[PDB]
């Protein structure tokens, strides 16, 4: 691609500058270029990749919701549908790009739990964003792809990580949200968030001050959803 001529280290440096500048489309392009160098990503680099695309797709999701809401009010010219479709297609393209990077070849080469769970959670997340805008037949298959990715990530995280591990906690939070918002399974969402919270609570005594802060932050997010849902 267009980043083929830039050094990997220069791409990472520019991704960090783009983050500071809140230039998230640039940041995503830089991190895509870094992934396409073919080497594995460090922990910091994985988080830069995720920050970049989370912000890009987050803007698209917010825009899609505004337009879909106007479109649905409009049905109580073709322009609202056309423009919603344009944004939807762009959103789908970003999700497909992220899923492509994970499939070529980040997940395949990810052997450690911290990297493999991170990437499989991302795969679940971006199928979930596809599911948010999907409708018929495709929606069922997209939902199952999200579920499968989250489930593999869950299986690894329960075998290989402590219950306070922030990657494990964030995965459980998002899988629970998948159950509630996508899969029409609020009871599974609640059960997963509660069991996750309770098992982390019992492990907090093992944690340093800084690890305690990181784990309790995500535990509070789990609690926030449980409060909303119960």
């Amino acid at each position: 691609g267009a980043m083929g001529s830039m050094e990997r280290a220069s791409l990472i440096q520019k991704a960090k500058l783009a983050e500071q500048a809140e230039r998230y489309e640039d940041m995503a392009a830089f991190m895509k270029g870094a992934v396409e160098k073919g080497e594995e990503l460090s922990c910091e680099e994985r988080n830069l990749l995720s920050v970049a695309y989370k912000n890009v797709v987050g803007g698209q999701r917010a825009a899609w919701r505004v337009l879909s809401s106007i479109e649905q009010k409009s049905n109580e010219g073709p322009e609202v549908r056309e423009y919603r479709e344009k944004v939807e297609t762009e959103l789908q393209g970003v999700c497909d790009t992220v899923l492509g990077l994970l499939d070529s070849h980040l997940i395949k080469e990810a052997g450690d739990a911290e990297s493999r769970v991170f990437y499989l959670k991302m795969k679940g997340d971006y199928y979930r964003y596809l599911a948010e805008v999907a409708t018929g037949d495709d929606k069922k298959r997209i939902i199952d792809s999200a579920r499968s990715a989250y489930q593999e990530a869950m299986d690894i995280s329960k075998k290989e990580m402590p219950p306070t591990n922030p990657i494990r906690l964030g995965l459980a939070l998002n899988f629970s949200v998948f159950h509630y918002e996508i899969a029409n399974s609020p009871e599974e969402a609640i059960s997963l968030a509660k069991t996750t919270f309770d098992e982390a609570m019992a492990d907090l005594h093992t944690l340093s001050e800084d690890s305690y802060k990181d784990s309790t932050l995500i535990m509070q997010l789990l609690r926030d959803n449980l409060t909303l849902w119960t």
Partner: peptide, 8 residues
């Protein structure tokens, strides 16, 4: 939306 993890 807005229920998921707000960072990576």
């Amino acid at each position: 939306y807005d229920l998921s993890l707000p960072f990576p």
